[PDB]
Design an enzyme around this catalytic site. Structure first.
Site, PDB file in Angstrom:
ATOM      1  N   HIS A   8      52.999  27.499  62.422  1.00 10.74           N
ATOM      2  CA  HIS A   8      53.311  26.684  61.253  1.00 10.74           C
ATOM      3  C   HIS A   8      53.242  25.196  61.546  1.00 10.74           C
ATOM      4  O   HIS A   8      52.922  24.412  60.650  1.00 10.74           O
ATOM      5  CB  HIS A   8      54.696  27.032  60.719  1.00 10.74           C
ATOM      6  CG  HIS A   8      55.077  26.279  59.483  1.00 10.74           C
ATOM      7  ND1 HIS A   8      55.511  24.972  59.511  1.00 10.74           N
ATOM      8  CD2 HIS A   8      55.112  26.659  58.186  1.00 10.74           C
ATOM      9  CE1 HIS A   8      55.781  24.574  58.281  1.00 10.74           C
ATOM     10  NE2 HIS A   8      55.550  25.580  57.459  1.00 10.74           N
ATOM     11  N   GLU A  17      54.445  23.511  49.802  1.00  7.45           N
ATOM     12  CA  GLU A  17      55.049  24.424  50.757  1.00  7.45           C
ATOM     13  C   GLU A  17      53.957  25.129  51.547  1.00  7.45           C
ATOM     14  O   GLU A  17      52.929  25.517  50.992  1.00  7.45           O
ATOM     15  CB  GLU A  17      55.951  25.441  50.055  1.00  7.45           C
ATOM     16  CG  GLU A  17      56.725  26.323  50.997  1.00  7.45           C
ATOM     17  CD  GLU A  17      57.526  25.545  52.027  1.00  7.45           C
ATOM     18  OE1 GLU A  17      58.076  24.482  51.688  1.00  7.45           O
ATOM     19  OE2 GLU A  17      57.613  26.001  53.186  1.00  7.45           O
ATOM     20  N   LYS A  28      57.367  32.719  49.004  1.00  4.32           N
ATOM     21  CA  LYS A  28      57.562  31.271  48.965  1.00  4.32           C
ATOM     22  C   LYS A  28      57.767  30.784  47.536  1.00  4.32           C
ATOM     23  O   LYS A  28      58.645  29.955  47.280  1.00  4.32           O
ATOM     24  CB  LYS A  28      56.390  30.539  49.613  1.00  4.32           C
ATOM     25  CG  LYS A  28      56.101  30.958  51.038  1.00  4.32           C
ATOM     26  CD  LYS A  28      57.323  30.874  51.923  1.00  4.32           C
ATOM     27  CE  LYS A  28      57.528  29.476  52.438  1.00  4.32           C
ATOM     28  NZ  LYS A  28      58.689  29.376  53.353  1.00  4.32           N
ATOM     29  N   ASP A  34      25.843  53.557  54.668  1.00  5.56           N
ATOM     30  CA  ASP A  34      25.060  52.633  53.863  1.00  5.56           C
ATOM     31  C   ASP A  34      25.090  51.249  54.492  1.00  5.56           C
ATOM     32  O   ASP A  34      26.080  50.864  55.113  1.00  5.56           O
ATOM     33  CB  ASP A  34      25.599  52.570  52.436  1.00  5.56           C
ATOM     34  CG  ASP A  34      24.499  52.549  51.406  1.00  5.56           C
ATOM     35  OD1 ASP A  34      23.419  51.998  51.681  1.00  5.56           O
ATOM     36  OD2 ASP A  34      24.701  53.102  50.314  1.00  5.56           O
TER      37      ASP A  34
END
Ligand SMILES: [Mg+2]
EC number: 2.7.7.48
Length: 1566
Positions: free
Chosen positions: A80, A126, A145, A1117
């Site tokens: 953070h 934030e 948040k 695929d």
RNA sequence: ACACAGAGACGCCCAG
RNA sequence: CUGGGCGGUCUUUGUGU
RNA sequence: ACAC
RNA sequence: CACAGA
């Protein structure tokens, strides 16, 4: 990267604004990762940083070099801190600076960065980071948040000076960013790059010391320790593994991981394969020497013509060589009798002699009619009076008779199979039986079909509007649509009623009634010479029925007087009838259980077809026109496919897609649709098959002659010259694409006869007889010309290294250390109860291996929860405790012990493998490891469902960024053949062990070695009949090979003598190793991507081509996209030739990895690509709406009358999101209403008139009433919305108010008397006082079980669940459900929380005079949590209530568009389960602090006032007696948002815009 | 009539 | 060749999303 | 409902 | 008391 610049582009208005969030992917290319050296000290965390490699990848400018320190006390937030530094320059603030003080304890929270602009606005941002790969984690973090601070901000947004505040969230992960703030792709890329650096720092720092991270919960620590101990102490006896299973030496893995790749070998092989592919290109596309485009197309046409004639001549030589036949495709008469009132009018009295002398059928019908006229009529028409008596106050009587038939008539009937088992040794029977096995000639004369498909009268009005069945349907529709009365609804209802009076629907109604009669009469029986006579209820049609055993055929003959046949469907496709004077008769056709579904659903299928194709051709659903003959061809083809219902015909139609996609191939290549003749030959058995095959061959030669024209009309690309594959009529792209799926009308759920299991066994063992003799190229060495099953070790290692490069580049250079932790956690956290499921398991063991010992016994399968309950009662709780014994059992055996059966699918011949308990337990762990590894891969779409929509769309933005505007896109859609059975399993073991942390190596190796001795059990009845006949005499080699192998004549490698099983070493199975195969394909695609990039970088002659390469893949695929940017028109041709060569060599490089390219790959198409049935035509995403429209009746059996409407709603939402406009979806719902009332007994029960007239006054769901949606929003809103809106306009909440206060002062019908479920409960031996035990100990419903008794209670509660309640229902839902329409309104079938439906309606109506008051809001919340958005949306949809608008020249830019129509309201921030569990027990499940949760607890108190801190006292105050429903309601109260994705132009304004636009394509409503 | 490059079904069980 | 029985009857539902 |  | 969050 400046917060002021970020905030300076926010359009703040009024008070708090909460702008819609958005998502950013990792679109741009990222440079290398700089050098990071980390030394964690008690002083702090010291990090050195290198420099970002400077290039044309300016991303990485914020990273500065030098030494950085972080304090140890703050080292638990490196993610953070480091990610959002640079957006942090003025510290952190509180809710006190710019906001007032409200004196509530919320003054003091610190929302990251709070910034005030020069205007005076306040914007608070934030930040959050997440190590979660799926978008669910980003959504969860964003939501938590945004709910932490919304109340403290909306609290102070009222005190201050008329504020203008914006709340912003930025969430960053390795994958993407979710932010409600305006932002640029480059800002997103920078944040994600910084987060990658920060997480690498955090991982390295947390590795050395151990106090950096905060405290993990005890459950997680226990799980990780338990799994780590298991993997440290697991010893799988590698010496015995080598002795037992073949090719299982651990030396192979050691040498694979130690020896590098041979780069000289790789480059030499690459040069050889390039040369070979170039030679093949020039030879097969006629490039050399020097011819022009038309001169080459003229040769392509000749080659296609030659191949087609060769195939026709080959098929013609194996037929009966006949050129004319007398069969009919539709085995039913063309009669259209007018529906009238009911009475048995057979007394013509002159037909009882004219019938007697007209043949065997005449004799039979004369005897029947004479006996009925002389005798009683009970059973022929049902008696109303006695039925009403039994209802008010289930063996059903049928009319049986025994005609005195003669031997001649009996023999003539037996030729059609009526009693043909006792006549099977005569002369004529044996001759016809021999003649029935021959196949038709390709040159048969089928022109009646060709005339019928264009010149029928199916869509003509029948003028039967005012009849009984139409009146009933119209009455119910008007009552259902009364509440939403508007001109729009009237227009759509009138259109539906117009479509209900067409000839084909009037035909299908009596066909459906006849099918329902047969479905009911299937379960009866007759003695020899007995028959059953019946009348057909609104139609003057009589049927004679001969049932055998309800698991076999049922025969029927139809009879009608000639005066009653008012009209007829025209055409020569119908079987011919018998004229008997005044009567018409029919010659005893037959049906089965599986072939009744299409006949029951026919009216609804035809209605949907008419509405759909009228919409697709541009005709508005309120105008009356004449059919345009394209409508006739499409609708007639749907009709014929539905009535014939055969796999071969479905497969001939389905293959047109691959031949017609070949017209999109661009120069320098040619269209080659003649590679699909490999699948086209095979026996032909119907005239319709002959016709369809000839039309398909004509389409093939036409496509090979001329490609689809590509024209730039605006800069957007549109194709011209498209046509319908079968009809040959010119159309547009959407209609052509939808036309490929017409074969899906054939009944998927088809019974397999014992005649046709040899084909499945052949497909299984076709490759086992090919396994290489020497194991050299199964993992040890290198080869350049590999055999069938082999591969080259160097190429495998090169692909693994390339994928590892991409993995490191995305996830940082410590991804393996995080992967180890994630895998250990997910292994340790699992218990047996997660495994215990309602899924079949095999009982095949070493007691069923000898057919001598088996014959008398009958083999049966069990279900997985039985064995898991045995384990739980033994004393096993954790999966770790179970694998240790499961592996030991498997190693004591030497087998895998599978049993087989066939799957029902619209594809080919897919077989299904069922394992046993020990095999399932062993496979679980390796599948979870492979899934964890695949979740990291950046171009795999099995563990990442968003990547199948993200990569193709972001390729354009990436190409524009790296090349500028005006770039050519060139693609390749690839399919792989023999995907399973082509893979030797050592390959998967090596590739998975490359990516794992080396403590898992032994377990993975031992677990995957067990796939190299499989034993698959064949069917016992098949074995019986094969043992009956010693010799085979068959022309197919596999038949005689199997017979001789089982009887000991020859010796094959896959069957022993006298055995009951098939052995096989090569090949994995279908779906068992899904994620391992996906990971291998991802490695191969990464190798191709690096190879193409290097080739483009060193272009032809040394000059460099500038281009962008994209790949994507799933399980088998894949797709490749390349964008180039040429300089001049001289450069363009050579660059495109270079690209075509690059894309052409994939089919030559594929065998080196053990993969074989199929013939269904469309290579080198410019502006299109298809990946998973999704066709991206430049900027015009197309989906086949017909696929989901043809499945809007596949209901479930259910248990309650009110849970049928939920299934109908799910199907409707599927259809709408598949690309259907709102008006079309409303018409589809009208058809669903008709289906529902027909299963309720419209055409069977006599008392439906009284029930309907007595229900139209009391319109309640669970008494059978159907609720319709608003046409402007047909499919968007669900059943809960319709119920909420119905309880507020008519008398339903009035009824609910009676039921509410009577509680404060749902009509189930069982299907089997719960016999099988009860017997399942009897063997388990579970306690019957589990409710009381969990009442006295409530921790079981919130806390994971911790001992044997609690785990027992957990399972005991689980096995009484509504999900487990209905799983013992077998297939063929529609016949079994419609059979109960005989005894529905008149027998005691419902046990309300027994009585008949008429009786319950009488009880409810007797309570309808005491009804008091309408609904109240406080408990309207309790019934409907989302009762505010419902009112908002209901108020939004009242502006559009008329049919006024204009037709607009439509723009063509189609894209998926998500719509949120019901959001989540403002409740306690968490979930009720989480909060209640958190307070009531010691469990930190919610993510709030200690002082927190008190506000949420007190806010939750507002809803109840009886809820308290003690569970015991809480239980005794509420209206709920037991915790088992307390927990149920706690989970219920947490309301769920409804969201729907749409197709249309890019976009509360969204709701109005889609309502305006998507009502009808090209129409602007209001 | 169904199924099938001829492997099947076209009723089964009991008592007479 | 006479009489009596025969339904949530099994066939029949794998792995993932 | 889609694929395998 | 307030922080971070697979
Ligand atoms: Mg494909």
């Amino acid at each position: 990267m400046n917060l002021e610049v970020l905030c300076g582009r926010i359009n703040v208005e009024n008070g708090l604004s909460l702008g819609e969030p958005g998502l950013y992917d990792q679109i741009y290319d990222r440079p290398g990762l700089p050098d990071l050296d980390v030394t964690v000290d008690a002083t702090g965390v010291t990090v050195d940083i290198g420099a970002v490699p400077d290039s044309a990848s300016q991303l990485g400018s914020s990273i500065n070099a030098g030494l950085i320190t972080i304090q140890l006390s703050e080292a638990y937030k490196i993610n953070h801190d480091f990610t959002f530094s640079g957006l942090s320059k003025t510290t952190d603030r509180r809710l006190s600076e710019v906001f007032p003080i409200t004196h509530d304890g919320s003054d003091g929270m610190t929302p990251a960065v709070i910034h005030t602009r020069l205007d005076g606005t306040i914007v608070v941002v934030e930040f959050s980071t997440t190590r979660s790969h799926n978008i669910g984690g980003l959504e969860a973090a964003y939501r938590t948040k945004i709910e932490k601070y919304r109340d403290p901000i909306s609290r102070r947004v009222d005190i201050m000076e008329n504020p203008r505040v914006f709340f912003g969230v930025i969430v960053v992960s390795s994958g993407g960013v979710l932010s409600n703030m305006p932002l640029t792709q480059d800002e997103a890329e920078e944040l994600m790059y910084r987060f990658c650096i920060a997480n690498e720092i955090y991982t390295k720092a947390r590795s050395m010391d151990a106090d950096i991270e905060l405290q993990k919960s005890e459950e997680e620590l226990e799980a990780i320790s338990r799994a780590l101990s298991f993997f440290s102490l697991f010893e799988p006896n590698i010496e015995r593994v080598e002795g037992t299973f073949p090719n299982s030496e651990i030396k192979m893995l050691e040498q694979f991981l130690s020896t590098p790749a041979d780069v000289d070998f790789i480059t030499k092989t690459l040069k050889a394969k390039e040369v070979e592919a170039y030679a093949d290109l020039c030879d097969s596309h006629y490039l050399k020497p020097e011819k022009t485009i038309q001169e080459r197309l003229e040769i392509n046409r000749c080659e296609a013509i030659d191949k087609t004639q060769d195939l026709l001549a080959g098929l013609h030589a194996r037929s009966n060589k006949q050129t004319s036949l007398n069969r009919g495709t539709v085995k039913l008469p063309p009669w259209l009798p007018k529906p009238s009132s009911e009475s048995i009018d057979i007394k013509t009295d002159s037909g009882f002699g004219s019938l007697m002398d007209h043949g065997a059928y005449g004799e039979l019908w004369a005897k029947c009619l004479l006996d009925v006229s002389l005798g009683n009529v009970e059973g022929v028409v049902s008696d109303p009076a006695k039925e009403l008596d039994i209802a008010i106050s289930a063996k059903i009587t049928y009319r049986r008779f025994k005609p005195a038939l003669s031997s001649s008539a009996r023999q003539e009937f037996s030729l059609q199979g009526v009693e043909g088992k006792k006549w099977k040794r005569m002369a004529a029977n044996q001759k016809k039986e021999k003649e029935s096995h021959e196949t038709l000639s390709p040159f048969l004369d089928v022109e009646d079909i060709g005339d019928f498909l264009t010149f029928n009268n199916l869509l003509t009005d029948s003028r039967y509007g005012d009849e009984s069945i139409q009146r009933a349907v119209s009455i119910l529709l008007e009552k259902a649509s009364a509440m939403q009365d508007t001109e729009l609804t009237h227009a759509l209802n009138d259109s539906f009623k117009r479509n209900l009076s067409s000839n084909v629907v009037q035909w299908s109604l009596w066909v459906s009634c006849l099918a329902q009669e047969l479905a009911s009469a299937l379960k009866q029986h007759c003695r020899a010479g007995e028959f059953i006579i019946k009348k057909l209820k609104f139609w003057p049609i009589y049927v004679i029925i001969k049932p055998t055993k309800s698991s076999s055929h049922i025969f029927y003959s139809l009879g009608i007087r000639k005066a009653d046949v008012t009209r007829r469907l025209t055409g020569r496709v119908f079987s011919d009838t018998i004229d008997a004077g005044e009567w018409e008769l029919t010659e005893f056709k037959s049906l089965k259980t599986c072939k009744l579904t299409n006949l029951v659903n026919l009216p609804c299928t035809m209605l949907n077809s008419i509405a759909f194709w009228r919409e697709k051709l541009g005709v508005a659903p309120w105008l009356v026109r004449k059919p345009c003959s394209e409508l006739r061809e499409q609708v007639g083809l749907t009709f014929l496919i539905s009535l014939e219902d055969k796999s071969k015909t479905e497969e001939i139609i389905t293959l047109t897609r691959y031949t017609q996609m070949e017209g999109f191939v661009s120069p320098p290549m040619l269209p080659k649709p003649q590679k699909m003749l490999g699948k086209l030959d095979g026996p032909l058995r119907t005239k319709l098959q002959v016709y369809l095959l000839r039309k398909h061959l004509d389409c093939m030669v036409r496509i090979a002659s001329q490609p689809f024209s590509l024209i730039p009309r605006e800069g957007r690309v549109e194709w011209g010259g498209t046509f319908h594959a079968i009809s040959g009529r010119s159309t547009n792209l959407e209609n052509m694409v939808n036309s490929w799926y017409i074969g899906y009308y054939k009944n998927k759920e088809e019974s397999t006869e014992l005649n046709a299991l040899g084909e499945m066994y052949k497909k299984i063992v076709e490759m086992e007889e090919d396994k290489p003799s020497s194991p050299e190229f199964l993992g040890w060495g290198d080869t350049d010309s590999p055999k069938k099953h082999e591969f080259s070790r160097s190429f495998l290692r090169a692909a693994c290294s390339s994928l590892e490069r991409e993995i490191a580049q995305r996830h940082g250079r410590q991804w393996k250390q995080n992967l180890e932790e994630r895998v250990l956690r997910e292994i340790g956290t699992k218990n047996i109860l997660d495994l215990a499921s309602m899924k079949a398991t095999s009982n095949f063991s070493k007691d069923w291996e000898l057919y001598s010992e088996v014959q008398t016994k009958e083999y049966h399968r069990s279900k997985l929860l039985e064995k898991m309950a045995t384990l739980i009662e033994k004393g096993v709780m954790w999966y770790i405790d179970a694998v240790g014994q499961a592996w030991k059992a498997v190693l004591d055996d030497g087998c895998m012990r599978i049993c087989l059966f066939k799957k029902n699918q619209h594809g080919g011949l897919r077989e299904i493998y069922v394992m046993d308990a020990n095999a399932r337990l062993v496979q679980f762990g390796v599948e979870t490891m492979a899934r964890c590894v695949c979740e990291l891969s950046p171009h795999e779409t099995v563990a990442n469902p968003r990547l199948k929509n993200s990569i193709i769309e972001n390729h354009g933005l990436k190409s524009a960024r790296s090349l500028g505007p005006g770039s050519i896109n060139i693609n390749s859609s690839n399919d792989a053949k023999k995907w399973n059975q082509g893979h030797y399993t050592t390959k998967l073991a090596l590739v998975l062990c490359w990516f794992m942390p080396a403590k898992f190596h032994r377990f993975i190796w031992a677990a995957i070695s067990m796939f190299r001795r499989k034993k698959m059990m064949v069917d016992l009845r098949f074995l019986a009949h094969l043992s009956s006949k010693s010799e085979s005499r068959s022309s197919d080699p596999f038949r005689e090979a199997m017979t001789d192998a089982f009887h000991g004549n020859r010796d094959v490698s896959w069957m022993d003598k006298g055995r009951t099983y098939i052995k096989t070493e090569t090949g994995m199975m279908q779906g068992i190793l899904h994620f391992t195969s996906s990971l291998l394909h991802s490695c191969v695609q990464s190798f191709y991507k690096s190879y193409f990039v290097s080739k483009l970088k060193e272009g032809y002659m040394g000059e460099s081509i500038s281009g962008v390469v994209d790949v994507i893949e799933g399980s088998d695929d894949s797709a490749i996209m390349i964008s180039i940017r040429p300089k001049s028109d001289m450069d363009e041709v050579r660059s495109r030739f270079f690209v075509a060569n690059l894309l052409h060599s994939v089919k030559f490089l594929n065998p080196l990895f053990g993969i074989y390219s199929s013939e269904k790959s469309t290579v080198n198409t410019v502006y299109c690509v298809e990946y998973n049935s999704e066709f991206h035509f430049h900027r015009h995403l197309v989906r086949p709406t017909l696929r989901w429209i043809a499945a809007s009746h596949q209901i479930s059996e259910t248990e309650a009358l009110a849970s049928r409407q939920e299934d109908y709603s799910n199907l409707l939402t599927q259809c709408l999101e598949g690309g259907a406009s709102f008006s079309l979806t409303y018409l589809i719902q009208c058809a669903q209403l008709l289906h529902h009332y027909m299963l309720l007994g419209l055409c069977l029960h006599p008392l439906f008139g009284t029930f309907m007239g007595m229900l139209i006054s009391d319109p309640d769901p669970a008494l059978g009433f159907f609720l319709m949606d608003n046409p402007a929003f047909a499919g968007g809103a669900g059943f809960r919305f319709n119920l909420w809106r119905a309880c507020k306009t008519t008398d339903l909440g009035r009824k609910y108010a009676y039921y509410f206060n009577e509680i404060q002062g749902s009509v189930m019908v069982y299907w089997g008397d719960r016999k099988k479920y009860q017997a399942l409960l009897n063997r388990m031996g579970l306690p019957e006082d589990w409710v009381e035990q969990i009442d006295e100990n409530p921790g079981v419903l919130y806390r994971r079980a911790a001992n044997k008794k609690e785990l027992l209670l957990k399972l005991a509660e689980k096995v009484h669940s509504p999900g487990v309640t209905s799983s013992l229902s077998k297939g063929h839902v529609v016949p079994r459900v419609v059979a109960a329409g005989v005894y529905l309104l008149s027998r005691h079938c419902f046990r309300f929380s027994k009585a008949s439906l008429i009786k319950l309606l009488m009880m409810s109506s007797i309570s309808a005079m005491k009804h008091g008051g309408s609904l109240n809001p406080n408990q309207e919340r309790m019934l409907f949590p989302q009762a505010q958005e419902y009112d908002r949306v209901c108020t939004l949809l009242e502006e559009v209530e008329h049919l006024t608008g204009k037709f607009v020249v439509r723009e063509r830019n189609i894209v998926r568009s998500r719509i949120d129509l019901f959001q989540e309201p403002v409740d306690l921030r968490c979930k009720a389960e989480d909060l209640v569990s958190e307070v009531w027990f010691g469990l930190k499940r919610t993510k709030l602090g200690p002082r927190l949760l008190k506000e949420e607890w007190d806010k939750l108190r507002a809803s109840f006032a009886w809820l308290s801190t003690d569970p015991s006292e809480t239980l005794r105050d509420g209206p709920f007696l037991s915790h088992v429903q307390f927990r149920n309601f706690i989970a219920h109260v947490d309301a769920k948002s409804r969201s729907v994705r749409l197709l249309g132009a890019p976009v509360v304004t969204t709701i109005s815009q889609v309502v305006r636009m998507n009502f009808f394509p090209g129409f602007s409503l209001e």
